[PDB]
């Protein structure tokens, strides 16, 4: 019942529990943006069904050495999180907003 993560707003398949990545020791990171919004961000090595938009940027990055791009649900356009790139071990990963995903079984 806990294996697949889907978009909460439309059901698009996004990631899997098996693809969780413990960045800095924890797959979960609680962070704030410049607009004062708090997010519980889950780190994943891999995700699918997103649409990555905009130019990568280092500004305000919560993960040192990475640049981010906005990750939208590719089906509904809900903002699900960010794609990180340009770093090391790993080079890239996804930080997705936990409350914007629904977790459940494969069937
Ligand atoms: O690592 C990240 C991802 C992007 C995220 N972020 C936002 O959520 C945001 C909203 C408004 C203006 C600027 C930002 C920005 O850098 C942020 O603050 N850090
Ligand atoms: Zn969606």
Numbering used by the authors: 18 to 124
From the paper:
Ito et al. showed that cereblon associates with damaged DNA binding protein 1 (DDB1) to act as a substrate receptor for the DDB1/cullin4 E3 ubiquitin ligase complex. In mammals, cereblon has a LON domain and a C-terminal thalidomide binding domain. Architecturally, the thalidomide binding domain is a member of the β-tent fold, which consists of two antiparallel beta sheets that are oriented at an approximately right angle and pinned together at the top via a structural zinc ion.
Diffraction experiments were performed with crystals from two different crystallization conditions after 40 h of washing. In the two resulting structures, thalidomide was retained in two of the three monomers in the ASU, but released in the third monomer. Strikingly, the loss of the ligand was accompanied by the unfolding of a large portion of the protein around the binding site. In one of the structures, “Wash II”, three regions totaling to 37% of the previously structured part of the main chain were no longer traceable in the electron density. The largest is the most N-terminal unfolded region, which starts between β2 and β3 and comprises the hairpin formed by β3 and β4, leaving only a C-terminal remainder of β4. The second region starts in the middle of β5, comprises the first tryptophan of the aromatic cage, and ends at the cage’s second tryptophan at the start of β6, rendering its indole side chain disordered. The third and smallest region is the loop connecting β7 and β8.
